[PDB]
Amino acid sequence: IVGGYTCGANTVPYQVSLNSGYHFCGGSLINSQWVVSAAHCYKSGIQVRLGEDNINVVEGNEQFISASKSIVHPSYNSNTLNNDIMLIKLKSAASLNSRVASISLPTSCASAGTQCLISGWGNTKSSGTSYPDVLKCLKAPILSDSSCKSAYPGQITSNMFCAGYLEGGKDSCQGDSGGPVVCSGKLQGIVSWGSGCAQKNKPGVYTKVCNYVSWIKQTIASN
Amino acid sequence: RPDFCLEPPYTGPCKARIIRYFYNAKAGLCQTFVYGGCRAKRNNFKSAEDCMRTCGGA
Ligand SMILES: [Ca+2]
């Protein structure tokens, strides 16, 4: 996250780290065994880490659980990044406490001008490289479909949205993929793609979670 | 050996932090770089060994 602030420990209780020897992606805890993330974060040998703040040291609040299944959305297009969504079933159920809690799926879609929280352990420099120890947070509003399609002509589908600041400086970046965009307690988005990070007139692009709810509920229930 | 082995590493538009390998023709070895997780170009290998086998000699 470029331009954000330090969330403060365990204050985004539904944020997860996806680990493959190192932090490669984010995710959101949707119930005790299910995590939602980005399709492009698909790896084998995932470990999920719950209750993280400093991803580099062991703080005593963590639950490291391996994934039993990883289900990438049947219509994920790796060229167009349409349907950039995936579900991860943990080998065993997490223990839900105060440091580890899940996020509600939305009932409706958010509108333009909704202010959201985007969190992650990804790059904090727009140009350059600086990966933080602790979790980083950003309030960024949902952009209008029209401005999103102007920022990226011919590339936004009905399953995308744009959030952030057309002036730049505040965005999600490499490392942030799969992590939450949470608006009024509900999971609206998944950190997906952009043109670089925190560039002027190129906001971040996110998966429109509200289109998927049905698919998610039924996929969780039959796996 | 080849000419895609001379291209610079491509992170791409996605925002994962995935560590992969590319052939650095300047150095004459395979190096690591961050791959955003989508839209890879051909100078992008999952291990150093793969990279040396395909490019090493470029
Ligand atoms: Ca930790």
Q: Could you tell me which of A151, A179, A156 has the C-alpha nearest to residue A1?
A: A179
Residue stretches of the annotated binding site of A: 52, 54, 57, 62, 171-172, 174-175, 177
Give the Å distances, CA to CA, from A94 to A32, A46, A209.
5, 15, 23
CA distance B43 to B22: 5
- Lateral strand order in the sheet of A136-141: A5-6, A136-141, A115-120, A180-183, A186-193, A204-208, A160-163
Question: Given an 8 Å threshold on Cβ–Cβ distance, is B13 in contact with A194?
Answer: yes
* CA distances for B33 relative to A21, A129, B9, B14, B27, angstroms: 16, 12, 7, 14, 14
Residues A124, A131: contact at Cβ < 8 Å?
yes
Q: Where do the domains of chain A lie? A: 1-12+103-210, 13-102+211-223
Q: What stretch of H or E contains A15?
A: strand A15-19
Residues 6 or more apart whose Cβ sits within 8 Å of residue A128: none
- Residue B37 CA to residue A179 CA, distance in Å, equals 14
**Would you mind telling me the total number of residues written for chain A in this entry?**
223
Return the CATH number of the domain spanning residue range A1-12+103-210. Answer: 2.40.10.10
Q: Which residues have a Cβ under 8 Å from the Cβ of A201 and sit 6 or more positions away? A: A151, A166, A168
Domain A13-102+211-223 fold is: Thrombin, subunit H (2.40.10)
- Domain span at residue B32 reads 1-58
Residue of B10, B17, B20, B44 to mutate when probing chain A, most A C-beta within 10 A: B17
Q: How far apart are CA A143 and CA A145, in angstroms?
A: 6
A23 as an active site residue: the answer is: no
Nearest C-alpha neighbor of A193 from the set A223, A150, A148, A128: A148
> Which residue from B11, B16, B34 is facing A40, i.e. has the nearest CB?
B16
| Residue A123 near residue A35 (C-beta atoms within 8 A) | no
Marked catalytic residue, from A28, A37, A119, A177:
A177
The domain total for chain B is: 1
Neighbours of A183 (CB within 10 A): 23
Which method, experimentally, gave rise to this model? X-ray
Q: Under a CB-based contact definition with an 8 Å cutoff, are residues A120 and A74 in contact?
A: no
Are the CB atoms for A78 and A106 separated by under 8 Å?
A: no
Q: What is the number of residues in chain B?
A: 58
Instruction: Report which DSSP code applies to A64.
Output: E
Q: In angstroms, what CA-CA distances link A146 with A81, A155, A180?
A: 19, 12, 23
Closest CA to A35 of A159, A180, A146: A180
The C-alpha atoms of residue A47 and residue A119 are separated, in whole angstroms, by 19
The answer to whether residues A189 and A181 touch, using CB atoms and an 8 Å cutoff, is: yes
Closest-CA residue to A177 (of A3, A23, A12, A30): A23
Burial state string for A195-214 with b = 16 or more CB within 10 A and e = fewer than 16:
ebbbbeebbbbbbbbbbbee
Q: Which residues, in sequence order, are bridge partners of residue B33?
A: B20
Coil/strand/helix, residue A40: helix
Quote the tokens at residue B48. Answer: 């150093």
Q: Following DSSP, what letter does each residue of A73-101 receive, concatenated?
A: -TT--TTT-TT--EEEEESSPPPP-SSS-
User: Do A192 and A203 contact (CB within 8 A), yes or no?
Assistant: no
**Catalytic: A68?**
no
Q: Which of B15, B18, B39 is nearest residue A173 as measured by Cβ atoms?
A: B15
**How far, in Å, CA of B2 to CA of A152, rounded?**
33
**Cβ–Cβ under 8 Å, residues A21 and A175:** no
**Contact: A24, B38; criterion CB under 8 Å:** no
Which residues are B20's β-sheet partners?
A: B33
What is the distance in A from the centroid of ligand 1 to the CA of A52?
A: 5
Residues 6+ apart with CB under 8 A from A138: A1, A3, A4, A5, A117, A118, A119, A170, A171, A172
How many angstroms separate the CA atoms of A142 and B57, rounded?
A: 49
CA distance A178 to A165: 20
Q: Do B15 and A79 touch (CB under 8 A)?
A: no
User: Which residue among A78, A79, A175 sits closest to B15, beta carbon to beta carbon?
Assistant: A175
Q: Nearest residue of A to residue B18 by CA position?
A: A24
Query: In angstroms, rounded to a whole number, what is the distance separating the alpha carbons of residues A65 and A51?
Result: 11
**Region label for A85, one of left (φ > 0), alpha (ψ between -120 and 50) or beta (otherwise):** beta
Looking at residue B20, which CATH number applies to its domain? 4.10.410.10
Q: Measure A189 CA to ligand 1 centroid, in angstroms.
A: 25
